[PDB]
Amino acid sequence: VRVNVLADALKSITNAEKQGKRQVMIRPASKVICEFLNVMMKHQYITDYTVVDTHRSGKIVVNLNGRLNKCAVISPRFNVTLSEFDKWEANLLPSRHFGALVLTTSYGILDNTEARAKHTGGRILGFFY
Amino acid sequence: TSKRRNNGRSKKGRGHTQNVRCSHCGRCVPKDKAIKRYQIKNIVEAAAVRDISDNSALTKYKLPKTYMKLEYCVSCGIHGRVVRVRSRTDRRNRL
Amino acid sequence: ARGLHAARKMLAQRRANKWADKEWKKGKLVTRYKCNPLGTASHAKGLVQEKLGIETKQPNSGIRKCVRVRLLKNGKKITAFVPRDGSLNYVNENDEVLISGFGRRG
Amino acid sequence: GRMYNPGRGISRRCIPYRRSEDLYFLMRAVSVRHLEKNKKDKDAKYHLILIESKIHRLTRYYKSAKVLEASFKYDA
RNA sequence: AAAUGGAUUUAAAUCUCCUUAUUUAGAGGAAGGAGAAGUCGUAACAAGGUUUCCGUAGGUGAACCUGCGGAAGGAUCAU
RNA sequence: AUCGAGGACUACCAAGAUUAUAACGGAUAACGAGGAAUUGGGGUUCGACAUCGGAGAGGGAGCUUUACAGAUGGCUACCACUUCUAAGGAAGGCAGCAGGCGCGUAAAUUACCCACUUUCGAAUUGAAGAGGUAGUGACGACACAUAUUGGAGGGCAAGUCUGGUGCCAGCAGCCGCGGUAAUUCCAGCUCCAAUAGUGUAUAUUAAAGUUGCUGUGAUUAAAACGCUCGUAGUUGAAUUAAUUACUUUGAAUAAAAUAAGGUGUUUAAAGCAUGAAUAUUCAAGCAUGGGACAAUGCAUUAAAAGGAAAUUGGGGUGACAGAAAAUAACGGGAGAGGUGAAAAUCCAUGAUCGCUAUAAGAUGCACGAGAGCGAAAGCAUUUUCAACUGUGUCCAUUAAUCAAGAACGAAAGUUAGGGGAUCGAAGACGAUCAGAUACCGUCGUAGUCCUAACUAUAAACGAUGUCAACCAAGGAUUGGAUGAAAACCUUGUUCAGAACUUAAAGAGAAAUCUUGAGUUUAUGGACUUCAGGGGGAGUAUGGUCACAAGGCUGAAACUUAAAGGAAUUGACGGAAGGGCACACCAGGAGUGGAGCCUGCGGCUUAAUUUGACUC
RNA sequence: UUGAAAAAAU
RNA sequence: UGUAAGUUAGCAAGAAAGAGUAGCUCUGGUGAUUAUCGAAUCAGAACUUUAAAGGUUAGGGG
Ligand SMILES: NC[C@@H]1O[C@H](O[C@H]2[C@@H](O)[C@H](O[C@@H]3[C@@H](O)[C@H](N)C[C@H](N)[C@H]3O[C@H]3O[C@H](CO)[C@@H](O)[C@H](O)[C@H]3N)O[C@@H]2CO)[C@H](N)[C@@H](O)[C@@H]1O
Numbered sequence A: 001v002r003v004n005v006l007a008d009a010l011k012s013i014t015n016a017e018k019q020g021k022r023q024v025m026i027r028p029a030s031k032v033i034c035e036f037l038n039v040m041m042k043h044q045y046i047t048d049y050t051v052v053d054t055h056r057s058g059k060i061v062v063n064l065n066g067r068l069n070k071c072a073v074i075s076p077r078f079n080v081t082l083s084e085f086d087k088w089e090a091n092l093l094p095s096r097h098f099g100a101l102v103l104t105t106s107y108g109i110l111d112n113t114e115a116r117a118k119h120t121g122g123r124i125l126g127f128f129y
Numbered sequence B: 001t002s003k004r005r006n007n008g009r010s011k012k013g014r015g016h017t018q019n020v021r022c023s024h025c026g027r028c029v030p031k032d033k034a035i036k037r038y039q040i041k042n043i044v045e046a047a048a049v050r051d052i053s054d055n056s057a058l059t060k061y062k063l064p065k066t067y068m069k070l071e072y073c074v075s076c077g078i079h080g081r082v083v084r085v086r087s088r089t090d091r092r093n094r095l
Numbered sequence C: 001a002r003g004l005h006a007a008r009k010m011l012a013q014r015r016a017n018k019w020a021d022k023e024w025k026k027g028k029l030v031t032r033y034k035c036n037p038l039g040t041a042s043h044a045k046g047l048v049q050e051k052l053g054i055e056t057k058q059p060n061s062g063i064r065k066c067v068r069v070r071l072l073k074n075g076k077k078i079t080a081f082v083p084r085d086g087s088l089n090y091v092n093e094n095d096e097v098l099i100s101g102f103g104r105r106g
Numbered sequence D: 001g002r003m004y005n006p007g008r009g010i011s012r013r014c015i016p017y018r019r020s021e022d023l024y025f026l027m028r029a030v031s032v033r034h035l036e037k038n039k040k041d042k043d044a045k046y047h048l049i050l051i052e053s054k055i056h057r058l059t060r061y062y063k064s065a066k067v068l069e070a071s072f073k074y075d076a
Numbered sequence E: 001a002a003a004u005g006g007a008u009u010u011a012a013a014u015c016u017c018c019u020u021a022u023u024u025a026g027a028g029g030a031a032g033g034a035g036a037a038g039u040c041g042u043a044a045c046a047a048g049g050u051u052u053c054c055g056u057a058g059g060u061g062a063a064c065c066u067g068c069g070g071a072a073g074g075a076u077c078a079u
Numbered sequence F: 001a002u003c004g005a006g007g008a009c010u011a012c013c014a015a016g017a018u019u020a021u022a023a024c025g026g027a028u029a030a031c032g033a034g035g036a037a038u039u040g041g042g043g044u045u046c047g048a049c050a051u052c053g054g055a056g057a058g059g060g061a062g063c064u065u066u067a068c069a070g071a072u073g074g075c076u077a078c079c080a081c082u083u084c085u086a087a088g089g090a091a092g093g094c095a096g097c098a099g100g101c102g103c104g105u106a107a108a109u110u111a112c113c114c115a116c117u118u119u120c121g122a123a124u125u126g127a128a129g130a131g132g133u134a135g136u137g138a139c140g141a142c143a144c145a146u147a148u149u150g151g152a153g154g155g156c157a158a159g160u161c162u163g164g165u166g167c168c169a170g171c172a173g174c175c176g177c178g179g180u181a182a183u184u185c186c187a188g189c190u191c192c193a194a195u196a197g198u199g200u201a202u203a204u205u206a207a208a209g210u211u212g213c214u215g216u217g218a219u220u221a222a223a224a225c226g227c228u229c230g231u232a233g234u235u236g237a238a239u240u241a242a243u244u245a246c247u248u249u250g251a252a253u254a255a256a257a258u259a260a261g262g263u264g265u266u267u268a269a270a271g272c273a274u275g276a277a278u279a280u281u282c283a284a285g286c287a288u289g290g291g292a293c294a295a296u297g298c299a300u301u302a303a304a305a306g307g308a309a310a311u312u313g314g315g316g317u318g319a320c321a322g323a324a325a326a327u328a329a330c331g332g333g334a335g336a337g338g339u340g341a342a343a344a345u346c347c348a349u350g351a352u353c354g355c356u357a358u359a360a361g362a363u364g365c366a367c368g369a370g371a372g373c374g375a376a377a378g379c380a381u382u383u384u385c386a387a388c389u390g391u392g393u394c395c396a397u398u399a400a401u402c403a404a405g406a407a408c409g410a411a412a413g414u415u416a417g418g419g420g421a422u423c424g425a426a427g428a429c430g431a432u433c434a435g436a437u438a439c440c441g442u443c444g445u446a447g448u449c450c451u452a453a454c455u456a457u458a459a460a461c462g463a464u465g466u467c468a469a470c471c472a473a474g475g476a477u478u479g480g481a482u483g484a485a486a487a488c489c490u491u492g493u494u495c496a497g498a499a500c501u502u503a504a505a506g507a508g509a510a511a512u513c514u515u516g517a518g519u520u521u522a523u524g525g526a527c528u529u530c531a532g533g534g535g536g537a538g539u540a541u542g543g544u545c546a547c548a549a550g551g552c553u554g555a556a557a558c559u560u561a562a563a564g565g566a567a568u569u570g571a572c573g574g575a576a577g578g579g580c581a582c583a584c585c586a587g588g589a590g591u592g593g594a595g596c597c598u599g600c601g602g603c604u605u606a607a608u609u610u611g612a613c614u615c
Numbered sequence G: 001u002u003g004a005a006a007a008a009a010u
Numbered sequence H: 001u002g003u004a005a006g007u008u009a010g011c012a013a014g015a016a017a018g019a020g021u022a023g024c025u026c027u028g029g030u031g032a033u034u035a036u037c038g039a040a041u042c043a044g045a046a047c048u049u050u051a052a053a054g055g056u057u058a059g060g061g062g
Helices: A005-018 A031-042 A082-092 A112-118 B049-054 B074-079 C008-020 D042-064
Strands: A023-026 A048-051 A060-063 A071-073 A100-105 A108-111 A123-128 B019-021 B028-030 B035-042 B065-072 C044-055 C063-071 C077-081 C097-099
Touching (some): A005 A060, A031 A108, A082 A100, A100 A112, A108 A112, B065 B074, C063 C097
Antiparallel strands (some): A023 A060, A071 A123, A100 A108, C044 C063, C044 C097, C063 C077
């Protein structure tokens, strides 16, 4: 069954950009799914999205412009200590200036670029090139 | 690996089909794996069809035809020249 | 078995799946101390009993001079390869001969 | 998809976009236990096992909802 | 307060039943492996000259043969 | 009772404690920690031995002194040892420092002194095989005079040097080199790597993405349970403007050591001669800022999650047909079965053949399909359950996968009845063959069929586990719903199902796959099982189930450089298709038969010289 | 219709 | 209280092996009728002795 709603959402976006689609639909829209797209919009990997109200966790339409390379979820969210960031950057990211991790912290959803500044850790949701 | 995509037979959604007996050697072969040919032949061959009409007690008698369905297996289906070995890219022909 | 709380299945799987290698398993079975004539020893001292010559395998030809040596710690019989050319003469009957493995491990 | 048969139907009711027993109906198990007259009906014996587990699945859940007292037990 | 008698405690040592590890058992019996040119056959790889193989049962110096069902990894994707 | 809490022990009372989150038991060549070897991150192996804690003084057992001993360089008894003896007796515990025997591949002097550090004492002094110096010391570490080891075919640096040996000696960790011209052997000359170093054998680590959380594979190389149900376990849709986990900080946290801050032991290995704040603490624990994600149970929905309340269904159970053979009567008088050819066999008691009747056994053609149903096995004559679709119906997370456990599970096989027509393991004849104990022909017990009870294996195959999201183009099919065309036929939209064609795209080692074998070095959706070179071998032993055959679980000793997968070329086929040749058909001449010329083999000889041996 | 075999290594 | 190999799964089995048993004085359990009445049976506790089936009957075992 649907174990991780975020996992099925991200693979839909990754597959859509590999086919050159202009906008894709994700039927469920949790809080983290919308929050994850907000992290990818500050980096300008997507232009904008929308949240159709269907009374059953309505769909999301993501507007993308050939910029997202690989957005993926991470299997059960590992506890990322602040000192452990360097372990994951060197593996999950292509280069020290390109990739962007996504983490969940008590102060809200944050990316690796800003969560280091906020001086906090927590679980990890995924990444995107 | 797989010389054929459908493994020679022609069954997809069923796990068993009743056996039939080959018409030449009498070898138990499945219904779909068998080679089915339908033969229509007049009992009187063309070399003798006009011989009957010269001396026939009837007036407008039309000679009937024999209706037999022959099923062969691969062992004597190929040996009987019913089917032959085809090219690798010519195997997919199904007409 | 990727789940965060499933750290017992993964560990138990590796404990089960580690026994199938031919190399490390030799390091946990009690056979080195039992069936290996050398045991865990580098060298084995023995006594000469018989002089024997083993012919080579199919592609090659010739007779390889060898000696059947009986150990002093286990008493087992092992065939030993006399090292050099014409060196079978140097060895004698009932003398201390050192036996130490071969190139291939064990 | 269905719990037991590998069929995947999606027929549903669609409650419109505006705002302006099940345990009892499964005790099918009684109707099958037809079994006495046809003891060799091995296909009905298998299908009865599926229905028996279906009831033993709502029992385990209804108890945690306190709908049924924890002394509930299904016997024919 | 010394020898010594007796009754308890902790009990060494030993005899009889009760499991783990190491050994003697002859040639003994039944297996397996290795070693250029040793016998008998043609079983397999071409349609290998009876298509091959799987499960099961029987037979037979030997591969193996035959019965029931299955498979194409068949020699047919086909009338 | 003990200094002290307590089943520590005693008397009474109740039956309670652990257990799949691995209880109880078994092995270690197991003293634990600080740490050591090696690491890109992650990890693997070792740790008796510097320091801390634990235990022991040949083996337990019992006690003395004392503040602390179950003390053993204290005592006693027993078991096993050793020493002197006047033959009556006596003491001893080197797992303390040296040293002796044995054990082994394996390990130093039967030296001197309390000077450095420290401890004990009747206390400034006396004692210490603790401690220090000296001695052996190629385990190792640092600076450094000017000499060996192994090799010179590839991995790997180096000889297209000369003598011998002639698949024999031999070298070779691996591939191999040697059967009279050795780049590899035994030797003579030369230089290649390292240098107080260098070969050898064993073990640890990296390579090994060959143990895989980071990080593997499961169609064909090894490997998806035959399928389904199911407990433990793991994983569980969205939504809200009291603990625990998570996360940020601190406190305390043995030294040695890890990386070092400083410091010219001449550098360095060293050493700490200001003592780096030195950071260390994985696992746990204490206090604290935050609650996004999370686990625990006392109020929103209505998930292309699930479950419950007009059709389709060779889905499961129970209660018409003539073929082959037999029997009966009738016609006919000589063959009939069978094979490439025959024979054994049946027939003058009338066979084979033809019409008509009778009874049981079995079967279910044509319709019959890359069509349908079923979890799998499977399901084919007519006259209880599963699924799809329709649905402004109900519940609200009831969900997915699943060790243990259980149901169903082709054919053969077992047991007892009924039946026993056709075919037919064993078997008997007849052929073929060198033999044939087989293929071919004839006969025939078990079986093939039904019932009841077992067995639980198959190429149980799509060699492809189950659930879930995305996924290019096209024809066609089965069952529904909705429109037009007025149950069937043509067409549009849409849901479910078995499949198919193309791909210049994606994957793969390739064949191939596309309703994945795609979304994977740009590696993580959730779960279960299996595999680690080939043999030994699914064998032995052990356990368990079965009336039995057998099934499920199931190694090692030893042996070996390959075994195996997909495609290319060639060759081969008692495989096919297309052509050709005095190859053959229709023939002529012949050779082979006779005498003789000549060549060859053989015999002979002093020599009867030798090359050639199917075209 | 019948039709079996070709000593080990270079 | 405990009881092996083997096995036709029924048996082997009273397998083998070990503990208790006396006398006297007591206590409790097992019922009928509404406190009385009746039965031999089992268990437990003190105290004593010449330490208890053995006068008779009465398996040797592997
Ligand atoms: N390896 C065990 C088994 O050996 C079986 O067969 C074994 C023997 O029967 C077989 O023997 C072969 C023989 O078949 C062949 N026709 C003649 C050959 N000379 C024999 O060879 C055998 O024996 C000779 C005797 O000197 C040895 O020199 C030679 O090394 C050895 N292989 O060789 C095998 C090993 O000795 C089967 N191959 C198989 O079941 C299995 O491999």
